[PDB]
């Protein structure tokens, strides 16, 4: 939790997922790692004082759409998330946009297969939350 190399974890998870390793640029500066995606908000991965976070901003109009869709969003949150600390995704706000966040449980940080489960699971929820805020 302390010798943890997040770049190597991410690289390994993406390999397990069957990613084209040529898409992977320079990661190793211990800044936020960003996964850009075909039709979805980018996924950010970061270490913040020994906590690993996965998150995404949900779009320029997400806070406004939230005014009409908060119940559906809450139900989705309450269904739970097996790879997050507390068993639940969190919502914040960054750059005037709603943010979906996972404080990753250390059980999912042990190897690339485990971290891949967390990343692909996050992808699934990103699809669902972003569509609920359309």
């Amino acid at each position: 939790m302390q010798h943890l190399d997040i770049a190597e974890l991410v690289r390994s998870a993406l390999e397990v997922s069957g990613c084209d390793p040529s898409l992977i640029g320079g990661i190793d500066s211990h800044s936020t790692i960003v996964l850009d995606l075909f039709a979805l908000p980018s996924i950010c991965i970061s270490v913040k004082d020994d906590d690993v976070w996965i998150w995404a901003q949900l779009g320029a109009d997400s806070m406004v759409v939230l005014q009409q869709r908060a119940y559906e969003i809450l139900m989705t949150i309450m269904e739970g998330c097996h790879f997050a600390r507390g068993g639940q995704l969190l919502l914040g706000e960054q750059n005037g946009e709603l943010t979906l966040k996972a404080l990753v449980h250390p059980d999912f940080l042990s190897d690339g297969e485990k971290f891949s489960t967390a990343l692909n699971g996050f992808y699934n929820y990103l699809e669902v939350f972003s569509r609920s805020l359309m």
Partner: protein, 220 residues
């Protein structure tokens, strides 16, 4: 085969910009009342900024009062599509007027509040009369006149007595058409609500205060 994430991965990069972010309980409680109203606006965050930056005590008090009444109306109108639609529309209209107004020193919000205990009782009493008129009734000429007779004295009282209104006394003596026109708008709002609508009576009872305060806010 590759996971959906892998199949849809467009690049992996790093960013020095992309970054995450890190108690007044009475304020928190007040914010939650405002949020129930501000959700009806085009942009709740923009409403919160207008409100928070205002120094108009009476204007902010008018909005807070409305927000509290809105919460009561949502309690009573949530089982009828016509009533909830009415509520959402008055919410949208009130909040849009907040944005248009801006809550400066001279504001549409604040002047039409009761400034004495007597005026408060007059407003409650007239609201109760409106409910009786409508349930005794589109509105007939009789009912229309009775509404006018309830509303006009309240509007005239505010002009006569209020300091939340910033207009010079002498200039207020020019406003007889204001009272006529505002009271007519009240008739129209009540008449349309009655058309769209024990359960019903409770719906009307919670809606009346909002419809009236929204009319006040639209007075030029």
């Amino acid at each position: 085969q590759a996971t959906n994430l892998a199949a849809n991965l467009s690049a992996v990069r790093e960013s020095a910009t992309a970054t995450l972010s890190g108690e007044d309980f009475p304020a928190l409680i007040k914010q939650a009342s405002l949020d129930a109203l501000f959700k009806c606006g085009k942009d709740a965050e923009a409403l919160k900024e207008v409100f928070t930056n205002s120094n108009n005590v009476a204007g902010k008090k008018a909005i807070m009062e409305f927000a509290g009444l809105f919460r009561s109306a949502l309690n009573a109108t949530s089982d009828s599509p016509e009533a909830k639609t009415l509520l959402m529309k008055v919410g949208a209209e009130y909040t849009a007027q907040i944005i248009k107004d801006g809550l400066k020193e001279k504001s549409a919000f604040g002047p039409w509040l009761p400034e004495t205990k007597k005026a408060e009782a007059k407003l409650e009493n007239l609201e109760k009369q409106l409910l009786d008129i409508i349930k005794n009734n589109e509105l007939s000429k009789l009912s229309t006149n009775l509404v006018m007779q309830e509303v006009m004295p309240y509007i005239a009282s505010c002009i006569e007595h209020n300091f939340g209104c910033t207009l010079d006394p002498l200039t207020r003596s020019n406003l007889t058409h204001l009272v006529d026109k505002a009271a007519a708008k009240a008739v129209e709002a009540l008449d349309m609500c009655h058309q769209k609508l024990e359960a019903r009576h409770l719906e009307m009872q919670t809606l009346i205060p909002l419809l009236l305060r929204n009319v006040f806010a639209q007075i030029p």
